[PDB]
From Swiss-Prot:
The biological function of streptavidin is not known. Forms a strong non-covalent specific complex with biotin (one molecule of biotin per subunit of streptavidin). The keyword Ribosomal protein does not apply. Belongs to the avidin/streptavidin family. It is found in: Secreted. GO terms for molecular function: biotin binding. This is Streptavidin. Biotin binds at residues 37, 48, 86, 102, 114.
Length: 129
């Protein structure tokens, strides 16, 4: 099913997901995403560093803008020994969204690697749900 036939201004700022988490991101001119993430759930307290990338020249045919970012869940307060990656697309307009699927991998022994990774889906909006 996979194949092949500003974003910057739209992405930069604060976003909120359906769990009550807060994303604070700056999109750089050459594809960088940098900022912080605060999770409303899980083994998390305060803000965590986030870094990622986005397509800085997306298609102009009504398609979304591909992007992704990572948070390692270690900061000055807690270390969950886990990291999450969100993969998705930014959809602009009056009801802008970042629609993502997210993998959360915990450090495990080899015996437990089969249960290392969660998959979920987060939808981000510019106003709090
Ligand atoms: O408990 C952990 O291992 C660290 C916190 C994980 C929180 C996850 S990341 C995917 C989902 N979306 C969120 O905003 N919070 C949870
Ligand atoms: Ni956890």
């Amino acid at each position: 099913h996979h194949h092949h036939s500003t974003a910057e201004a739209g992405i930069t700022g604060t976003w909120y997901n359906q769990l009550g988490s807060t994303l604070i991101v700056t999109a750089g001119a050459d594809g960088a995403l940098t900022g912080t993430y605060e999770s409303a759930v899980g083994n998390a307290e305060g803000s965590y560093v986030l870094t990622g990338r986005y397509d800085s020249a997306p298609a102009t045919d009504g398609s979304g803008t591909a992007l992704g970012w990572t948070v390692a869940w270690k900061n000055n307060y807690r270390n969950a020994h886990s990291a999450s990656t969100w993969s998705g697309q930014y959809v602009g307009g009056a009801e802008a969204r970042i629609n993502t699927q997210v993998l959360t991998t915990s450090g495990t022994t080899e015996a437990n690697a089969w249960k290392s990774t969660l998959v979920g889906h987060d939808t981000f909006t510019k106003v709090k749900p």
